[PDB]
């Protein structure tokens, strides 16, 4: 059966984690997958999730299966976070959320759902976007089309072009948005652009699918939610695939959410019984540990307060590394002005490096970066700043 | 978009857990989902997994993403368990295993894999089988066909009919087998039938897909693996979807395995790079907690010894409840001979009850059973035995 199955390509982000692992050089530097590291270049488990696990160890009685949609407290907390405490989507019982295995699991459950219970034929993703977006919607049966987004000469969002591009998406089509910290560019819409974009979506009949994986990483929890809340206010229907991997440092426990919203209580509940059927034909019901940890921190005032300080510490450490990086590239003789990266939000820098400069940096300096030129600023510490900056200048 | 999406049917097993939850009667009894309960009708978290979690709490340093296939130690331990320590599939590096979100996740990753990288059009499942089998392969794009299995008058496996049925499956087709504790019948093949079945599979060119979810629940860990090992010895290719939900009482942590085997090292590795690509387009990489717990117990002698005693305690408690149940139905005036259930292996009893007796037992006695007549003997305690037996006799 398996004789002429040919080898799949390496995953553009996960394939690097493998190559990095196999390298033997003592000074190599990672800069690839979006995982946060602290001042010491370690990825610690947050104190607040560690307190939550101790509690879960003392207080669990069973490992008996959760329902298809996960922990109720988990989806209620998620709706508060995404839409505001006492939102009208919450109060009119317009939103239903299933607990999924990460935000990727949320993107596929949504895909599956739409592919099997909707007229959708086409999802619209930005150019550039997360590499795996194309792969999840194509597995579902959906076609991926791209829209204009980034002006690379100017290092800005090209809103006119983004409008004109999207001008050929039909009514019935899904349009994917990043909630905040666009991946890979780091450039987000303004509030005024998000609302212009919200009102155009509705006069054209696009169903919005938000990928919200970095809430708390651009300006704050709530501030980062404004764009989505501006869409929630205009729209009868939305689906948001959200994650807790980064903002909770809970990467390998796989914890996210697919929250579905329709015009009313009856429609949302009927639409969700099909979403729960897609889940049951895939992994059946979700992993408890990580999601019980989120629910515990979010449920407890003391434990929530510790967590928000932790996430504030992470936004601030990335912001200092971002500034450090353009400062050191300048005084290391960078033969280009790199201060546009000061303006990007998130864990990353979309540096401008070509595929072959990126290739040469791993092959002879051992600094690993994604081939789109995307580098992880949260992977930068004061201790490896001068080494990677010296490497970059040597290839420019 | 969502206006005319109609409601999905209730899941035949999970829908009952919901109905049970909503019932208000103080004496209701569950008997539906296959979850083990102890003498007190509780589903405890095993002492050995509780010791493993304490250790993981002391000793973890990060929640950083696992690779697409999970924990290496986890897949190596899984191969020992499934095929024998020092097996030639292990020694010739013929087997590769991905860590999945339960055995359902393993069944779908396999489905996805085959649907996208193989000529397979049709999976063959027994009649009766696990209700969700049909649902996972149909989501993948695969057709489900059924083969003959159980003689209901005689309460036996009808091997002639099972042979003749399967006589119209072509070369290239998948045939699903249950490793041990057939669900729902509890009737397994003999060693002699498993080997007859193994040698027929190979002269006909069926690819075997084993669902192995109850290892340790019929006779012992190793004894329960004989059938699969008899197939492993004849076959160049196999795929086994295995679970640790029941034998580790780790139901909601979602822990299982899809292990793939090809004719040699090169083919298996090339076939697995595509299997890892199907995973990445679905939930991306697996939940660590449950799988790190399995790997820890299986890696440690002290902790392994405690676990095997625990699983031995569970096989034995179900065997005493099985015997109790036919004894009490007889002295409660059962108007049928029920001692064929003494012979079935596993958590269940395929009782013979019709859909309307099963319906009437939940509607006026509140004992919940699956509508195929399947009742969970591991849900029976000495304290609810007489109540449910009295209920059953009243409906016969
Ligand atoms: C991280 C991320 C996801 C998925 O998050 P996980 O929780 O790790 O699955 C999806 N899309 C984007 C853009 C992300 O950054
Ligand atoms: C339990 C079971 C599965 C899946 O096991 P999980 O680990 O709970 O996903 C698959 N098939 C059968 C027959 C089972 O009993």
UniProtKB/Swiss-Prot annotation, chains A, B:
<dbReference type="Pfam" id="PF00155">
    <property type="entry name" value="Aminotran_1_2"/>
</dbReference>
<dbReference type="InterPro" id="IPR004838">
    <property type="entry name" value="NHTrfase_class1_PyrdxlP-BS"/>
</dbReference>
<feature type="binding site">
    <location>
        <position position="130"/>
    </location>
    <ligand>
        <name>L-aspartate</name>
    </ligand>
</feature>
<dbReference type="InterPro" id="IPR015424">
    <property type="entry name" value="PyrdxlP-dep_Trfase"/>
</dbReference>
<keyword id="KW-0963">Cytoplasm</keyword>
<feature type="binding site">
    <location>
        <position position="34"/>
    </location>
    <ligand>
        <name>L-aspartate</name>
    </ligand>
</feature>
<dbReference type="GO" id="GO:0033585">
    <property type="term" value="P:L-phenylalanine biosynthetic process from chorismate via phenylpyruvate"/>
</dbReference>
<dbReference type="InterPro" id="IPR015422">
    <property type="entry name" value="PyrdxlP-dep_Trfase_small"/>
</dbReference>
<comment type="similarity">
    <text>Belongs to the class-I pyridoxal-phosphate-dependent aminotransferase family.</text>
</comment>
<dbReference type="InterPro" id="IPR004839">
    <property type="entry name" value="Aminotransferase_I/II_large"/>
</dbReference>
<protein>
    <recommendedName>
        <fullName>Aspartate aminotransferase</fullName>
        <ecNumber>2.6.1.1</ecNumber>
    </recommendedName>
</protein>
<dbReference type="InterPro" id="IPR000796">
    <property type="entry name" value="Asp_trans"/>
</dbReference>
<keyword id="KW-0663">Pyridoxal phosphate</keyword>
<feature type="modified residue" description="N6-(pyridoxal phosphate)lysine">
    <location>
        <position position="246"/>
    </location>
</feature>
<keyword id="KW-0808">Transferase</keyword>
<dbReference type="GO" id="GO:0042803">
    <property type="term" value="F:protein homodimerization activity"/>
</dbReference>
<dbReference type="GO" id="GO:0004838">
    <property type="term" value="F:L-tyrosine-2-oxoglutarate transaminase activity"/>
</dbReference>
<keyword id="KW-0032">Aminotransferase</keyword>
<feature type="binding site">
    <location>
        <position position="374"/>
    </location>
    <ligand>
        <name>L-aspartate</name>
    </ligand>
</feature>
<dbReference type="InterPro" id="IPR015421">
    <property type="entry name" value="PyrdxlP-dep_Trfase_major"/>
</dbReference>
<feature type="binding site">
    <location>
        <position position="183"/>
    </location>
    <ligand>
        <name>L-aspartate</name>
    </ligand>
</feature>
<dbReference type="GO" id="GO:0004069">
    <property type="term" value="F:L-aspartate:2-oxoglutarate aminotransferase activity"/>
</dbReference>
<dbReference type="GO" id="GO:0030170">
    <property type="term" value="F:pyridoxal phosphate binding"/>
</dbReference>
<dbReference type="GO" id="GO:0005829">
    <property type="term" value="C:cytosol"/>
</dbReference>
<dbReference type="GO" id="GO:0005737">
    <property type="term" value="C:cytoplasm"/>
</dbReference>
<comment type="subunit">
    <text>Homodimer.</text>
</comment>
<dbReference type="GO" id="GO:0009094">
    <property type="term" value="P:L-phenylalanine biosynthetic process"/>
</dbReference>
<dbReference type="GO" id="GO:0042802">
    <property type="term" value="F:identical protein binding"/>
</dbReference>
């Amino acid at each position: 059966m398996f004789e002429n199955i040919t080898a799949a390509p390496a995953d553009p982000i996960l394939g690097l984690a493998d190559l990095f692992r196999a390298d033997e050089r003592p000074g190599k530097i990672n800069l690839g997958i979006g995982v946060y590291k602290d001042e010491t270049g370690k990825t610690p488990v947050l104190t607040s999730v560690k307190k939550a696990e101790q509690y879960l160890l003392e207080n669990e009685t069973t490992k008996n299966y959760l329902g298809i949609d996960g922990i109720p407290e988990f989806g209620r907390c998620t709706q508060e976070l995404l839409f505001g405490k006492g939102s009208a989507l919450i109060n009119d019982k317009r939103a239903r959320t299933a607990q999924t295995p990460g935000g990727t699991g949320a993107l596929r459950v949504a895909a599956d759902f739409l592919a099997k219970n909707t007229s959708v034929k086409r999802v619209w993703v930005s150019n550039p976007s997360w590499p795996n977006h194309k792969s999840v919607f194509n597995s579902a049966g959906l076609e991926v089309r791209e829209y204009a987004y980034y002006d690379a000469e100017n290092h800005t969002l090209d809103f006119d072009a983004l409008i004109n591009s999207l001008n050929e998406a039909q009514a019935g089509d899904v349009v994917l948005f990043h909630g905040c910290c666009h991946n890979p560019t780091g450039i987000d819409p303004t509030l005024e652009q998000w609302q212009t974009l919200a009102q155009l979506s509705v006069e054209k009949g696009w169903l919005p699918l938000f990928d919200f994986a970095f809430q708390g990483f651009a300006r704050g929890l709530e501030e980062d939610a404004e764009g989505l809340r501006a869409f929630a206010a205009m729209h009868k229907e939305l689906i948001v695939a959200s994650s807790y991997s980064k903002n909770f440092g809970l990467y390998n426990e796989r914890v996210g959410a697919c929250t579905l919203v329709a015009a009313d209580s009856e429609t949302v509940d009927r639409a969700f019984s099909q979403m729960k059927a897609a889940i049951r034909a895939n992994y059946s019901n979700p992993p408890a540990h990580g999601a019980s940890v989120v629910a515990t921190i979010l449920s407890n005032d003391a434990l929530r307060a510790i967590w928000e300080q932790e996430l504030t510490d992470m936004r601030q450490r990335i912001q200092r590394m971002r500034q450090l990086f353009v400062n050191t590239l300048q005084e290391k003789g960078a033969n280009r002005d790199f201060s546009f990266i000061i303006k990007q939000n998130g864990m990353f820098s979309f540096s401008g490096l070509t595929k072959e400069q990126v290739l040469r940096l791993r092959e002879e300096f051992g600094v690993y970066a994604v081939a789109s030129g995307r580098v992880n600023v949260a992977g930068m510490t004061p201790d490896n700043m001068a080494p990677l900056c010296e490497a970059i200048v040597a290839v420019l």
